[PDB]
Symmetry: D2
């Protein structure tokens, strides 16, 4: 069907893309980067994250595939030498799709702006002190003082979340996970410390105490927001879909990336 291919842009990835397009030319496959049904990302996890954000308005009619030309690749779990086999299997269809949960971030002012994250959304101050009230389903939970906060999807838990001490969650769990960045805890200031895991339909609201300017990141797109009244997190209703051609379990992916390969 309709497909497109993004590339990290180095020689290796560009030529792989050109060879895959040539192999696709031998089947009933049309290159269309406006309304593809298949998005192939060639590069690393950064390249894959860009492909997701490029098509985040047609997530429900798209299956993603990642090919890793360098190292790691939690999302890009295909090797370049298997590109010919991928073309052939993907051309013949008959593949199953798997779906990972997404995170919805809403930023209110004094209008509304919403974002979708595949890894995480983080909040930090505008250079001054970061102080926010953390409100869980309209219940004031804690006043956070520190460097910032990170809300991760399940597939994002192996990324920034992991570096902050968070737990690794299997992506079949529809949840989001909040981790602290360097909170103050003395006799006067008090946070929970532990990462927090939230189910679907729970809403986590960050509300400013004094300064209302914040740096908000969504999958490493980092934007300064001014005059912020509230930042709201919830598990999205939308999901990302992966074309899956082989069994490559999440815990094996974890083993391969952090333990050994």
């Amino acid at each position: 069907m309709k497909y497109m291919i993004t590339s990290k842009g180095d020689e290796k990835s560009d030529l792989l893309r050109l060879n895959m397009i040539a192999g696709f030319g031998e089947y009933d496959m049309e290159y269309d980067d406006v309304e593809p049904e298949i998005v192939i990302s060639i590069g690393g996890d950064g390249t894959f994250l860009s492909a997701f954000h490029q098509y985040e308005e047609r997530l429900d009619e798209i299956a993603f595939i990642g090919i890793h030309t360098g190292h790691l690749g939690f999302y890009a779990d295909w090797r370049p030498a298997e590109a010919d086999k991928l073309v052939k299997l993907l051309a013949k269809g008959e593949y199953q799709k798997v779906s990972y949960p997404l995170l919805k971030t809403t930023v209110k002012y004094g209008k509304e702006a919403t974002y979708l994250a595949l890894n995480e959304s983080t909040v930090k101050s505008s250079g001054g002190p970061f102080v926010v009230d953390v409100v869980i389903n309209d219940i004031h939970f804690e006043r956070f003082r520190g460097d910032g906060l990170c809300m991760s999807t399940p597939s994002g838990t192996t990324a920034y979340n992991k570096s902050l001490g968070g737990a690794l969650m299997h992506p079949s769990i529809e949840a989001m996970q909040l981790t602290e960045m360097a909170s103050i805890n003395n006799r006067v200031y008090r946070t929970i410390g532990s990462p927090l895991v939230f189910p679907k339909h729970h809403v986590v609201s960050l509300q400013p105490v004094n300064d209302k300017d914040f740096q908000i990141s969504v999958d490493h797109l980092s934007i300064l927001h001014r005059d912020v009244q509230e930042i709201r997190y919830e598990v999205s209703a939308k999901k990302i879909h992966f074309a899956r051609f082989r069994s490559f379990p999440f815990w094996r992916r974890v083993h391969d990336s952090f333990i050994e390969d």
Copy 2:
């Protein structure tokens, strides 16, 4: 209906129990500690854990309630001054039940023994070095060397799991969480470090490498097991049921126990 009441055994809890039995005597309520449908625990979380294990063969036909006579009480979320109101509301019924997930531990030898946990199951060595192979759904994930491992239920995540760096999970999530106790990590020895969160139907198997004697705890019942071939963890099919008379959200309970009250 049929009910019973356990007590921590100090003067305060015993007299509260005797006064509640007297108040129940004024309704169609029968004291039966063989087949109760309502189990009231008067004491702390330890007392409540004992009540759960006392009736763990009739979990599906029992609703539990906890009254805290001292401090904390994550499970015992009723104050003693509200005992009269509890009797009256519980006598009139018309209460909703809420269900928390449980953890199943299977210990194999060279027969099989199974246990149910409301907080967690932990494994440590018999005094020597603890070394186990961690196998996730029949896939070898890591060789663990250290003091031990802890597998927590969701409601258990605020207990031992929390002290080990684990995340706090809302009990509506059907999952179990594995945390490490003091693992060795150098050039030769390698674990994941992070807590791991597993969905229903995932099986985590611990398999001995050399020594096969282990200390296995289930909710602080600690038993030396000899000639162990495998320890298997999975989210149980059984659930604990709480009689709920008021809204007391999990995250408020967390706030009250760790942040302030």
Copy 3:
């Protein structure tokens, strides 16, 4: 002798300052904010840090005293109600001095700039990815990828260092302590993880890998540095001196600020 008094600037601190100046007027004491031998700080630890940086060129001929008008005060360990007693005892002299170690930061370009820290010096990137080579006494120790690094004095270990997982060190130990901010650790990227404690005369050098713009903080004075070739840390030869009138041990200060008071 010569003395001056800084104030946090709120009503409480200003009037305390004016009353102490009036009490000093009754002794052989001269208000001199150019070459004081005694510097009194009235406010919190921020106020005290400003007093230290205001006089950091005459550290060897100055004894500092802090009065805390609000909460905490690890450096400002005097209560406002004891201001009259402080004036009297300080006017009569006969006090012992205690000295805490300091941290020297050198920033090289492509000239040299040096700074003194009482709490810590931290390094972060200019908004992009932070990557530095960590070189210990001219030996390449690790390539750090993450949010940043923090080098703390001993008295600074209860501040930012503590929030980053660092150890609390008694200030009689002449040392500096390096902590990581959220480092990446996978199969490709590798840091030590643990805080590192360095003796006098050890030199820790941070050397850029790609980007050479960094945000460098010295006691929460945060300055963007461009064209950086090296950041060097070592225990300073200079020391801060406190006028001490009573026994208030460091570990009691720690107990009072973090455990209870």
Copy 4:
């Protein structure tokens, strides 16, 4: 002079020992395992720790050397292929000695018993709950509830201490470091959390609250102590001496064992 050689006891180490004894036979060197001046350990760090405890009454007249026949070896920093060169250089003398600090543990009852540690001393309960009052220089600092406590020497900081979150300290610093094992922290129970670093002459006393039976380990020699009134820690006046023939800096040793080699 007088020397002896301990072996891990496998074929590799025994034959290396026999070949080194043969090479020593060609110089003015006498095998004496009663009053050696040189103790060579052939094996791993466990073997080296046994050699230290075997001669801990003559520490001041002995220089230790370790040869690692397997992996790691923080104390045994010689490779087997350099055994001939070691014999020759050690026979000709003209080597410098380096000294590492030691930890003194005193256990009081209701008599006194003292121990020396090269890595650490740890305390755990006798199977029940571990509760101790932590007293620093006769000042009550905290009541600890949890799995146990670990007091490390500087060279011990890369061992158990590291797995507990402690900082790595250069062995030229005369200090000991206290780390917690899984402490409870809620509204009722409160510890400092952070590792604590103590200078020479500071005394840390553990005092029982209820149960007075404890498992006390000194360099992995673990002994059940009954009727304990106090456990006292201080930096020892004694030191271990290493024969050093080459420059092998501590931070390079750390790099080689944890980062890469």
